[model samples]
Target: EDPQLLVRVRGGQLRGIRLKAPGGPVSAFLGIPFAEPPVGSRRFMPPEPKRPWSGVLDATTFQNVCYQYVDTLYPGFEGTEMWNPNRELSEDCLYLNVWTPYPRPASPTPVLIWIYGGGFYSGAASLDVYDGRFLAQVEGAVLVSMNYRVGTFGFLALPGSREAPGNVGLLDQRLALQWVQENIAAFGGDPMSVTLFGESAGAASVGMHILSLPSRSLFHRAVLQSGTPNGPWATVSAGEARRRATLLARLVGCPNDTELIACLRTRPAQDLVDHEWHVLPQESIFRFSFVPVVDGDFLSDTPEALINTGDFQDLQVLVGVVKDEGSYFLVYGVPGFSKDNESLISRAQFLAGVRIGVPQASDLAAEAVVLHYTDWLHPEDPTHLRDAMSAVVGDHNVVCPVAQLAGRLAAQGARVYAYIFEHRASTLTWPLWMGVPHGYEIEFIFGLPLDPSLNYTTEERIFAQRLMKYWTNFARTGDPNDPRDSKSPQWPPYTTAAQQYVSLNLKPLEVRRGLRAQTCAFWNRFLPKLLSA
Candidate 1:
């Protein structure tokens, strides 16, 4: 019989399972509570430490996902099924899962804690796509994934009230990291060598944790994929946060400010999940309205301003965005863009709604953007316009911000590496005009199979292996490259002068120079003038 994989920690004893993987058998501890259930009075409050348990807690099965309405709200969206949490639902979801090749390795292995992203509204550690068994076994590291409060439960802030100071989700993440520091050693993980990594909102969360002094000591390195704290969607002001909270309160039939919060607390979790909604009047690229907010406590100033003053932790940083991060939104908002013909007025309206600068830009700025991106002779061809718009939006929202972050950090003499994910998986069947769309890099990273409509090819499998190796190597050491493998491509540190980035693709990754050089140059030249105007 297989030896029982039981580990004793602060709160309780956890019984894990020995699961078969590509490499070999691995141990998986799922649904281990890192915090007390955030239910009832603790609904919108920061996570509290979990209490001790009596007997061995069965951790074989995943826990209920934090309450979210992705399937119920957007039925046929492209990635809706990709994000399905194959578990029960509840607000009492503050659990984490861990996978390790060795329950007690000779030396403690490095840990990679994954934070899922869903515009800060949906996602759970229970999603099948996030399973870390193969990655853990192949990389010889402990892979951890955790769940946190989201939507109104996570981000609702009432103006000036301690009741809801906002960023409960972030606090939950911090608490999980704390639990890891206190307990990961039992699972053969080196808490002192933790690496925080995630995509989209999760990536942005990594960025926020980097800037926030409270979370600095928990992790030593970070990998930000397609997000940064400075992104347009990463944070909203206190006023915007409060306005959203008030809207939700009114919708739930609580009108008075004094009684609103209390009434909301009494509301069912499902009601809160179902009623939460945000719809922009026009087609906007920055579609997410609900996200991390600038509470005076966690975020005293704008992330951009904070970065300028060098008010951040000194750590190894890896940051990048997909070649076509904005293509996903283009298809979602303007389905007509796929057609052969589209109207100029429709295009103008779409351009007007795109958020590109700090204070937003003027009509002239929008026109300048259009002229720089558009092909006047082929304006009638919607496909051409779609490509142009997708490129512009991708650069404005993800590329430029990520480049700026890497540039700034490099200038500060920080160990920073950048990349551009340009490979389109052979499994992809979608009609994306750009080579690779947003979230496509995730499947490659997680080593998960593609959608049913698609098929994973050998090239993708090899690419997945390479991606996992690079990521796990980075977790073990600040550098992504394994010094032992001199034949493999070398990933150099990012700098403002060189602007080198590792180009991730199937044809074998290469370190390239000047990611979005022209567009970024234009933005660097004009964005300041527009922001001041």
Candidate 2:
């Protein structure tokens, strides 16, 4: 095995980068900048374009993470220094990396752009877990990942602050794609054939991009993992975005709204980072207190609202969620769960954080959540309540939105593919000291390893190979269906006439159509009521 490093002039700057591949023409490049570092006064503003430099910029080392101190949200949690380091946080974090398999002069390669997930508050392109070598080398396409502003740095909103129009993280993604379109040619990639792919927040961001007027022409395909627009937690309406701003101001001891926003904008970045900005009182599981804002212009409507109206017309799309997405709540100790009825009510009220319009439905909502998530008798089954909450929350937040999106896209005659990830092991996986938690499927999808004990067996490896093939095939062609795939039924286009999806399951892999009808329907009705309530 040899390290194949290369350099190129991007944005007119000679960037020093390395590529890891055994031999031959399959060219790869790492740590290429798509935008200028959004530091200093430029923080919270739109990302500036990358500037050219005379000397070659070394791209060997991975870039530092976006402002993410562990105590900010998941306080006191311990992890290896690789993912969490006790380091100074900053806003200068707009950088994206790329890896491309050498494409022939005539043969154009499809592009898969990755957005890392951490609830829009944390994550970086530099993590070793997200190494693109396997996906790019083995799957045979160009792969790209980038750093974006997270938490307050990317999505702070206030009244009349449309100048930065809140979804800066998403906008950074759009710009990264623009860079791919412009410069990926040198790396043997076809920018025209681009697929925006991500998990959790990244997946939700893909959903948001589907609705953005500015994002339409940027990419041709999308792959959403364990997240969607319809998810109750996706995006906030303009009114709520404003309300959150006011709440944040009050939390920081500022009485005057207008003056507070201005003063805070001018205040030192470290103060904002030091105050543990994202950790307000825990509220609804659906509310990411610091999330991408729906500013009427950039985010005109929430994801579900957009899908209901058939917004992302005529596009290739794929969406899915994990089997037990909610187990992570108990695993991570986020908040608002109680064994007793009255205690549950009080906890729910407490978790809701700020009391807003209308009387709270604490008891019924809490019990309904518990009942909906788990079987009453089999309280010990993590899957019982786990699957229920995951399905309910996952559907309300992502699945239903994807379903409605599939329907709308089908109405407009677009090719759509959907899936549900349903592979749960008998026991808990490693370091998580818990079963397959939220971020489990990540390395599995890329066929990389984050946990040694959770290593894919012969069976898991088989599945990973199939997943890579299915994904890469979709990236190359709008359809995941390959006449070459003898393993499963040919995937059909998602439509009103045929709501079909390939089941990425175990034992017998197959396609399920209009499955989970009741769950999907419940979400279609439940989301608006709960979110508005």
Which candidate leads in TM-score?
A: 1
lDDT of each: 0.78, 0.63
**How displaced is residue 57 in candidate 1, in Å?**
0.6
Instruction: Give me the runs in candidate 2 sitting further than 4 Å from their true place.
Output: 1-7, 15-28, 69-88, 102-106, 162-164, 253-259, 268-270, 274-282, 311-313, 333-396, 424-435, 449-455, 486-488, 506-508, 526-533
**Could you tell me the lDDT of residue 149 within candidate 2?**
82
RMSD per model, one decimal: 3.1, 5.1
Measured by lDDT, the strongest candidate is 1
**Model 1, span 332-406: residue lDDT tens:** 455344322332234654454343321255667777787787778876465666677777777777888887788
TM-score per candidate, in order?
0.92, 0.82
Ten residues in sequence with the least summed lDDT for candidate 1:
336-345
N/CA/C clash count, model 2: 8
